[PDB]
């Protein structure tokens, strides 16, 4: 169980002087998604490569999934899985139209639910809970990444979490809680005028999974 964010430990969005669109776009409509697919190739020993066609824009045909280590690559090598995650193009590299991502891989077989499960996200502004909304999934074991994407996306559409220029919120962190043990991700970019999408998305490379029935989600925001 990770301890909660200290004072100062969270990134402040007013100290990011680049355009927030660079963060918005990773949690907007478009994401990588596939059901019951096998890796077709491999570049480095800690990645696997999938043939997944982008239905919406056709920006990609092959997706490189990068993991934190070799043992994660070997577990899911040649096994039929589901893929879900946030992809990037800038500084994405391997070896028709390509894209990169981290983790987001879960076995397909035995992991399917007959009907979608609802997880209730709880949103706090300056310590006070203002609202709740549900996010749906049909997996027994779902990656934290998928649930993060679905929660931020809602927030982007309805709360203007990430806009073109900046955000109405100063800090933000999404907290996941499985029974007793919790962990969190910082929802804001690093300070300065540029935003490294690759480097930010790498936090998902451990492929962390939660149980869809047990897990609790809490987003803590701070206003300006």
């Amino acid at each position, epitope marked *: 169980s990770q301890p909660d964010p200290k004072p100062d430990e969270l990134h402040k969005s007013s100290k990011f002087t680049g355009l927030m669109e660079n963060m918005k*776009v990773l949690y907007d*409509d478009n994401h990588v998604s596939a059901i019951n697919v096998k890796s077709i190739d491999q570049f480095l020993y800690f990645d696997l490569i999938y043939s997944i066609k982008d239905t919406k824009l056709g920006n990609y045909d092959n997706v490189r999934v990068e993991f934190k280590n070799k043992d994660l690559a070997d577990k899911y090598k040649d096994k039929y899985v589901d893929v879900f995650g946030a992809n990037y193009y*800038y500084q994405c590299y391997f070896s028709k139209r390509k894209t990169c991502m981290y983790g987001g891989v879960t076995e397909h077989n035995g992991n399917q639910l007959d009907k979608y499960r609802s997880i209730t996200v709880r949103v706090f502004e300056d310590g006070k809970n203002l609202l709740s909304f549900d996010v749906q999934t049909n997996k027994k074991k779902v990656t934290a990444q998928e649930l993060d994407y679905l929660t931020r996306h809602y927030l982007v559409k309805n709360k203007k979490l990430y806009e073109f220029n900046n955000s109405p919120y100063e800090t933000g962190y999404i907290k996941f809680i499985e029974n007793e043990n919790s962990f969190w991700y910082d929802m804001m970019p690093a300070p300065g005028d540029k935003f490294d999408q690759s480097k930010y998305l790498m936090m998902y490379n451990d492929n962390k999974m939660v149980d869809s029935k047990d897990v609790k989600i809490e987003v803590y925001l701070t206003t300006k």
Partner: antibody
Amino acid sequence: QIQLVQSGPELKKPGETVRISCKASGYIFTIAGIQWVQKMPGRGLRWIGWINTHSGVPEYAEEFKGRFAFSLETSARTAYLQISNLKDEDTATYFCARIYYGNNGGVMDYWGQGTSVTVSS
Amino acid sequence: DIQMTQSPSSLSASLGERVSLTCRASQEISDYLTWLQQKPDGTIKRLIYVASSLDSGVPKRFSGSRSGSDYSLTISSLESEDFADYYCLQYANYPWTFGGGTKLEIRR
């Protein structure tokens, strides 16, 4: 290097649809979106909206919603604008412009040469 | 919606005159401002970006500055090709909106 080239003039009729293209070259297309602007004869510039080439999410000005639509073909590095129920007031020049938000110096940095649409029966 | 009042709408000048277009925001816009030029030709190019920075391959004589909610474009010494239209534009929030434009014509 970086250049946006638009398609030629169009002479359409009232009620017909038209499709103006804006082909970009000299950069990886997914790094920057494309905006559209209307120039009417003898009057100022008017913002139609833009579209993010990663993600695909469009943003339109209220007065152009419902009849003006943004579309893409990314493998061709090409942005389309489509206008539906053509009207006399749609007669104007249309310009595309690069929205490279990855750098603070890239908003509307490179412009297209413009496309003329004339609506008459 | 952010209204961008651009003044004056017509300006009369001569060769070598220092001139100054002002453009005011009805709401806080914080340096998200850009100046554009449209020639009689029709062609449009960006002049100034982030309110005060000169666009690459636009001559020194062009500059831009801020004074609160008051934004301005300055041309230190007019050449012939400069007698064109000039528009400011805010992209601080949606919809992005254009100033009414200034037309720069020659005195006689």
